[PDB]
């Protein structure tokens, strides 16, 4: 009805200076955006370092395979048993091309499945990719990209020098089978003349390779299998070495951690999707104001406290963990000096921030101690992994849990030598961790100075149970009341103003990452009062069918109750009985309901309606 909607055109251009850093300076120069960008860049470089370090062995094996073929009819090929998640391994293939171009041992063409709908297009993109690849190391029209031109172009340059011709097929299962078989036969026909190596991107198993390759195609194939690591193993490596690393001041809550790991383990093995979900959690945390720019290292946090305005103090006063801290103050002038003076709180904030950072440093060390103590036990009640005890220790009080009582009982059944060996393992692991990871980080001297006398006291109790059944209970009591009670509290029993550092809000991030369109459509077609907040459209029960409803919900409630086939006449009479122009409103409801896919018109039948959602 508008000038923007046209009856002829479908796309509209609003070009403003287009030729052949989106936001303004008002938010980029704010401190919360700078600290968010810095924290995200650190975490992204750490995850990229971990993924490259995980891939480097199989990368070296593939480069040795291609170079060993260059040192030397069937074509040599390399099936790479990669994971389910296809978007993750394009970086692996990019690193493989970079290592093959670094030694100048070969030149690589990457054949996506979208470019190879026919044999003609597959050969054309193959020759064009190799020609443009060697052009880009140091242009033909695609209809002139033939194998004879590839032979002449190879004879012109590299026959006087032997550069292999690596052909990546990253999505092996998405290729057409006949086009792939003809392509393998073509590449096998040109062996001797043109050196072809065919690395693959097989995702499911080797049975797919052995099934899609027939008798005659596989006889010209000399494949060698490599194995990339599993996606849960890479997830556990990232979760232990990034999201639990003490150097980062932004911690997730147990519910958010369990939500993201539930998304990974239950729905999709995409660690890229986990990365983007953690990025959305980081963005939703840091965009609460300039108060949340304090979530960093200590000295920059003190500069940030000295930078703070008054609204940010009002957002550190509104958080629910501040109210029991104000409530426990006995002095009456002190609450006056905290709540309205706004400079005494500015003097107070370094102590609270130091206590919070020290609490999470002690939490990480004590968590490592208790994971090595508990997870070596049989039946694993609190879990073996560090992340499970992280979730359980942050969610609720660990001591009151019955599973902790089960751990105490099954740890009390042990003999002397195995028990002393296990606690000595926990001692040496925590000492090694305090040496290697807490020491170079700032405010790590205070964490080691706090935690080390309790470790020495537990080691003295271990010597006492060595020199002397009953003393195992004293060792367990020293372990509890020196490590588990003090440094493994829940999130509710945290220090004051710990929110600036944890991210507890899971409802908004859950509805914004996980998308549920059918839930929103079902809730807007069952009770419209939930969205509109009418004073008259409220339903005490969801099938009441009140008469003041919106025009679509009456139609939805009249056809949800009926059978699969929907007659138009009796339902038109029912909609007339609930609430001329009424025929136009009914037909408009037909158009709105058919637009969403809840029904489809029975064109095949005598102009009736047919429901699709049951």
């Amino acid at each position: 009805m508008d000038p923007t909607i046209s009856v002829s055109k479908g796309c509209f251009v609003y070009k403003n200076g287009a030729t052949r850093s989106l936001l303004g300076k008002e938010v980029v120069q704010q401190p919360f955006y700078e600290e968010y960008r810095k924290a995200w860049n650190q975490i992204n470089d750490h995850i990229a370092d971990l993924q490259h370090r995980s891939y480097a062995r199989t990368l070296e094996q593939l480069v040795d395979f291609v170079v060993g073929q260059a040192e030397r009819e069937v074509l040599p090929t390399a099936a790479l048993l990669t994971g389910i998640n296809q978007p993750d391994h394009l970086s692996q293939f990019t690193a493989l091309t970079q290592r093959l171009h670094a030694q100048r041992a070969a030149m690589v063409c990457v054949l996506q499945s979208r470019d190879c709908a026919t044999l003609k297009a597959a050969v054309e993109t193959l020759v064009f990719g190799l020609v443009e690849d060697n052009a880009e190391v140091e242009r033909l029209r695609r209809s002139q990209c033939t194998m004879k031109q590839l032979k002449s172009w190879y004879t012109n340059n590299f026959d006087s020098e032997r550069r292999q011709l690596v052909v990546i097929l990253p999505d092996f299962e998405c290729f057409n089978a006949s086009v792939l078989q003809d392509l393998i036969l073509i590449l096998s026909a040109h062996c001797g003349s043109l050196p072809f190596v065919l690395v693959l991107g097989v995702a499911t198993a080797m049975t797919a390779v052995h099934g899609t390759l027939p008798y005659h195609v596989s006889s010209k194939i000399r494949l060698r299998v490599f194995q990339t690591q599993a996606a849960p193993t890479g997830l556990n490596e990232v979760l232990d070495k990034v999201l639990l690393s003490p150097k980062y001041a932004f911690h997730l809550s147990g519910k958010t951690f369990k939500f993201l790991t539930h998304i990974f383990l239950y729905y999709d093995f995409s660690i890229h999707g986990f990365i983007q979900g953690f990025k959305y959690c980081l963005m939703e945390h840091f965009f609460g104001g300039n108060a949340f720019a304090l979530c960093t290292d200590y000295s920059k946090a003190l500069g940030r406290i000295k930078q703070l305005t008054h609204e940010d103090m009002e957002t550190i006063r509104r958080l629910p963990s501040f109210r029991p801290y104000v409530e426990q103050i006995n002095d009456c002038k002190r609450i006056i000096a905290v709540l309205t003076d706004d400079d005494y709180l500015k003097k107070k904030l370094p102590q609270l921030l130091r206590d919070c950072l020290l609490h999470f440093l002690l939490f990480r060390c004590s968590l490592e101690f208790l994971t090595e103590l508990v997870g070596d036990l049989p039946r694993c009640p609190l879990g073996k992994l560090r992340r499970e005890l992280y979730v359980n220790c942050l969610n609720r009080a660990i001591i009151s849990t019955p599973e902790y009582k089960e751990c105490l009982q099954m740890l009390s059944f042990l003999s002397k030598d195995e028990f002393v060996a296990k606690v000595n393992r926990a001692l040496e692991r925590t000492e090694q961790f305090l040496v290697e990871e807490i020491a170079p980080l700032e405010l790590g001297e205070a964490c080691t100075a706090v935690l080390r006398p309790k470790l020495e006291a537990i080691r003295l109790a271990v010597d006492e149970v060595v020199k002397a059944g009953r003393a195992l209970q004293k060792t367990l009591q020293l372990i509890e009341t020196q490590i588990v009670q003090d440094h493994l509290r829940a999130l509710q029993d945290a220090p004051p103003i710990h929110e600036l550092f944890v991210f507890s809000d899971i409802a908004t991030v859950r509805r914004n990452i996980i998308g549920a369109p059918r839930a929103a459509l079902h809730t807007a077609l069952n009770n419209p009062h939930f969205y509109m907040q009418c004073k008259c459209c409220e339903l005490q029960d969801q099938s009441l069918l009140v008469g003041t409803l919106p025009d679509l919900s009456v139609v939805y409630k009249l056809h949800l109750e009926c059978g699969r086939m929907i007659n138009l006449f009796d339902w038109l009479q029912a909609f007339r009985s609930v609430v001329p122009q009424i025929q136009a409103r009914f037909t408009r409801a037909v158009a709105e309901l058919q637009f969403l896919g809840y029904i489809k018109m029975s064109k095949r039948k005598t102009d009736h309606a047919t429901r699709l959602t049951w």
């Binding site: 006063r317 509104r318 109210r323 104000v326 009456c332 002038k333 609450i335 006056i336 709540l339 309205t340």
Partner: peptide
């Protein structure tokens, strides 16, 4: 309760203390 009435009750109790 709201932050405003909580802070106001705390300040009124501190002034009455």
């Amino acid at each position: 309760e709201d932050y405003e009435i909580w802070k106001a009750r705390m300040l009124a109790k501190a002034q009455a203390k």
